[PDB]
Amino acid sequence: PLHLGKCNIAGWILGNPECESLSTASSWSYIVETSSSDNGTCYPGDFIDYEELREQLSSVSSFERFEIFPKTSSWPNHDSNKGVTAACPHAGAKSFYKNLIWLVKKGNSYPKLSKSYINDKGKEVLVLWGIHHPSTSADQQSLYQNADAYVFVGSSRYSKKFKPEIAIRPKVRDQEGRMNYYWTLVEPGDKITFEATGNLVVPRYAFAMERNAGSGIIISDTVDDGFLDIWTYNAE
């Protein structure tokens, strides 16, 4: 039973920086959360596919946080260190999620983006990428220059093409930017492909895993299954 001490699954797997630490390894029956409400998703946004994600992270053999592409060098052409925010701060300084990189413009103009992970070893590779929706076209051009801009995640077993919806949502942690969160899965066959002219929060860390099926005991609101027998009913 994996049990989080500092936050709900939103921020833990994204790396909100009250989350960080966690526990010792992974093979876990099901998750337990210390539930933040106002505090869960840091920079305000909707987590797409969040409840399906709730149960794929349930019965799991292992896990790996690995450097999908490293923040540093993966992006020759996009300014890789500038996005961090007060919404997701730390030490009073303005931080950002650990497992993704907010990619703002390098020297005003944003070319097509090519990046891809091609898998090899079979384990389920969980890749995550946020999508950012500027408050205004001010918020917009000063980050990703192309005011007409998109995001397309290629798969095989997945495809989606996003697009920012720019408008001023009410303030959440002083932020009228809103972001969106999406998680694909690339199995031993597939070769993932990203690309965009903007509004993409690209993965840094991502996970190799293996599941089975399971769980079932949880909180109302918020192998070892049937075995052979136990030492009573059959042999003695």
Epitope: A25, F63, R65, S116, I118, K121, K123
Partner: antibody, heavy 120, light 111 residues
Framework: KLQQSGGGVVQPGGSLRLSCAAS????????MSWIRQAPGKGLEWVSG????????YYRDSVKGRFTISRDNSRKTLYLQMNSLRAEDTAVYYC???????????????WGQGTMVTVSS | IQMTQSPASLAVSPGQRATITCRAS??????????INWFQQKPGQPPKLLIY???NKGTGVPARFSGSGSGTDFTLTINPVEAEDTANYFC?????????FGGGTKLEIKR
Amino acid sequence: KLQQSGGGVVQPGGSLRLSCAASGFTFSDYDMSWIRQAPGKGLEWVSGILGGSERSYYRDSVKGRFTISRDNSRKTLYLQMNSLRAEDTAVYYCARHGSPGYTLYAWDYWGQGTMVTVSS
Amino acid sequence: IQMTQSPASLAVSPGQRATITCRASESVSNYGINFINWFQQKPGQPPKLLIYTASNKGTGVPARFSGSGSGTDFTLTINPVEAEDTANYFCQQTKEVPYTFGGGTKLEIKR
């Protein structure tokens, strides 16, 4: 399981290219890399290049000037070393990456060395 | 920069165990994971993998060598200190992030 590099001396600002050689097979897949050892102490890793979807990883004290490539048939990797400062004289250990299993932990082994030297 | 740093340079008879140790800025552990991979260099020729991921002893390496630590700090330990060890040991590359070499320790053997 083998490793073979080379290069000697440069009058700073010149460009050099360190070769490396592999035998111990399956080179088509593996990640490979270099770590120069500074004199007087020694420091750190100068590039990390992948097997497929060719991607290149560097040090931010390096990033601009270095090009790391590989060939998969003649089965070599190289370091093209450009715009050279007295600061970077070291020896260059060519080294691979034992991944398999999930993570990509580290490098099992590294060629003898080649002392790249930067002077007039 | 993501940097580690050792318990300097101290020295022992060839009697028995010393501990080189690492202190990583962030946490390089997630878990069932860790990161730090020990390397030894013979003072005057090329690098050697000993311990990787703090725990697992590289097949081909001596037994005496041991290591453990949780995630923030690590320790190398070579118990029956041998005349053969004595070489400038590093601490390594941490996670996958910018990859950074701790910088080393001498290990002098007292005869």
